[PDB]
Amino acid sequence: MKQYLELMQKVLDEGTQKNDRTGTGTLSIFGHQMRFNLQDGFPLVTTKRCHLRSIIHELLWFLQGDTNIAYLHENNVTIWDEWADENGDLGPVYGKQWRAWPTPDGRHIDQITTVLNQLKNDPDSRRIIVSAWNVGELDKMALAPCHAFFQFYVADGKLSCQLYQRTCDVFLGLPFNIASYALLVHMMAQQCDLEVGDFVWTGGDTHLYSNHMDQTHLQLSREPRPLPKLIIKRKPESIFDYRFEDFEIEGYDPHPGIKAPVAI
Amino acid sequence: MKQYLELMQKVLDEGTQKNDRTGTGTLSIFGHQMRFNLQDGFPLVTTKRCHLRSIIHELLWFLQGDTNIAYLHENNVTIWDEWADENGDLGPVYGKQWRAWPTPDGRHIDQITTVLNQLKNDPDSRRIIVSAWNVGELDKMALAPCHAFFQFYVADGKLSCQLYQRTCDVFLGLPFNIASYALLVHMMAQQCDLEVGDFVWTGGDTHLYSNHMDQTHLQLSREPRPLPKLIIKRKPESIFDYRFEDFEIEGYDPHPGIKAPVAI
Numbered sequence: 001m002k003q004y005l006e007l008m009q010k011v012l013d014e015g016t017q018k019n020d021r022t023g024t025g026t027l028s029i030f031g032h033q034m035r036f037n038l039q040d041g042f043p044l045v046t047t048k049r050c051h052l053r054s055i056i057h058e059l060l061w062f063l064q065g066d067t068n069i070a071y072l073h074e075n076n077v078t079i080w081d082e083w084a085d086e087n088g089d090l091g092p093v094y095g096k097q098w099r100a101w102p103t104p105d106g107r108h109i110d111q112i113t114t115v116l117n118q119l120k121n122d123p124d125s126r127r128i129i130v131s132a133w134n135v136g137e138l139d140k141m142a143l144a145p146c147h148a149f150f151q152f153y154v155a156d157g158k159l160s161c162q163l164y165q166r167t168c169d170v171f172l173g174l175p176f177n178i179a180s181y182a183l184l185v186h187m188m189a190q191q192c193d194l195e196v197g198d199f200v201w202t203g204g205d206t207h208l209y210s211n212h213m214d215q216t217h218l219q220l221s222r223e224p225r226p227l228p229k230l231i232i233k234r235k236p237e238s239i240f241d242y243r244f245e246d247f248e249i250e251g252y253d254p255h256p257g258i259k260a261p262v263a264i
Numbered sequence: 265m266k267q268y269l270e271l272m273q274k275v276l277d278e279g280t281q282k283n284d285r286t287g288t289g290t291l292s293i294f295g296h297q298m299r300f301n302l303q304d305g306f307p308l309v310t311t312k313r314c315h316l317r318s319i320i321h322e323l324l325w326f327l328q329g330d331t332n333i334a335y336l337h338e339n340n341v342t343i344w345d346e347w348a349d350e351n352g353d354l355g356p357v358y359g360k361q362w363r364a365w366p367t368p369d370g371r372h373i374d375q376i377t378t379v380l381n382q383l384k385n386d387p388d389s390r391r392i393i394v395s396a397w398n399v400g401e402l403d404k405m406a407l408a409p410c411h412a413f414f415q416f417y418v419a420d421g422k423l424s425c426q427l428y429q430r431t432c433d434v435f436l437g438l439p440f441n442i443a444s445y446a447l448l449v450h451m452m453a454q455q456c457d458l459e460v461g462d463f464v465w466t467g468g469d470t471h472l473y474s475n476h477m478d479q480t481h482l483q484l485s486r487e488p489r490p491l492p493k494l495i496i497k498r499k500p501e502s503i504f505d506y507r508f509e510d511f512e513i514e515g516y517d518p519h520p521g522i523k524a525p526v527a528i
Contacts, residue, residue, distance in 0.1 A: 016419045016420060018388055018419065019388055020388070020390070028419070030417035030419070030424050030426065030462070030464065031297065031299060031417075031424070031426045031462065031464030031466070032297075033295065033296075033297040033466065035295060101399045101400060102368050102400070103368065103399075103400030103401075104366050104367065104368045104370075104400065105400070106368075107400065109399050109400060111399065124282055124283055124284070126284070126430060126431035126468070126469040127408050127430060127431065129397070129430060131395070131397050131399060131413075133393070133395050133397065133413065134399070135365045135367075135373050135375065135395060135398070136365060136366070136367030136368065136369070136371065136373060137367075144391050149395075149397065149413060149428065151430055151468045151469075153294035153295075153468070153469060155280045155282065155292070155294070156280060160294050160295070162294065162295045162468055164413065164428050164466070166390060166391060166393060166415055167390035167391065198294070198295065200294065200295030202295070202297065202428070202466050204390070204415045204417070204426055205390040205415075205417060
């Protein structure tokens, strides 16, 4: 997508050479932001073939609040396998914080429900936020939240959402992230009888791994194509009652897929 | 400052008319980002006369972790008076979360110390973060955090920091925020023997109050002037040992001050 490709080029032109968790080197920049008007089409990268299957399952899984990969496994979604322990547990990751952020006084805060309550009763609120960054729970998580905090906004009948992604693998991870949140906005908007607005993506440490440079140049030589259209076949009674089959993508005509090799 | 003025103009040109906590109306946009290369000068607005006195005291106060306004009062800093209760308490605001985020297992997480430990031992870490957004503590705070989360980054010997400000009063509040964090970056950099890099400011609900429109037009007619220079007269043994007198501003030549009327 135009915005996605411009970021790739920016990292290439302005990124600084360093490293990561001490594995593969990277080219990185700090601080970036782009906007996707969801009215112009669902932001699924077209310069390389992407799929939404795993993304959809993962989102529904997040919304359910259970952090055990069973549901994901039952459905052949393996992106979390790498981090899961023998029992398939990942600790208090995303889902747990979204639906049951633990407090010292013994409560489990349902941030998703809170947000919907706000979008319904006080849409102009300036703190319609969901945070996965639970400082006292980080150590117990298999992985610290990458997409750690997001905020909603309503204006002229449209629902917008900004995401703060503290760390971002532009080539491999980012395509996943944009689609995931774009999907959430569509779902929330539907539940709130609102049109979809903008998805504002903000990143912190935004980088490209050195072993993805050829892949990036290849992708940059491809012209983006019209964005596909998301179709929601059903209107569930709540944000927690969506099913995989409710989503469909129309008009997705992407360039060939590009593999993402990763060191271990 | 160029970046600050461009934001004002953007809100004017693209902002949508609505309201706030149901008081004064506003013109607002959602999602914005700007960068200040601290090597080009300390980002203290020059198109209107600003002062750093309150800002400095408040920052040192935050760093100390005590959320009672006594210290601020002792020094004639009154910006928190409005929210303080009879005992001068504000609840678990910024300071408390920065230095002692409470966990359900009974610990108080020192995020500032954690960050310094990271900048010292693992500067390439992608999670050098401090968050004030403690979901289970919001209700107890006199005010939910506006500048709620920030992340540091190190590259080529320079320390950068990005701030996520969920809500922003462009005219009245923003000047304060930029200077405050710019100051923190300078202090952290000094403690870490690093040069100052960029301060990346990211906002969520970014607005101008309708009763600040004339003020905004006035300010927009003024040409920004060279940014002043921050001087740190002393090199403390830790981030917690700074004193008000350690900071000085050189070359600050601003246009006349502009009052910010506020409804109640």
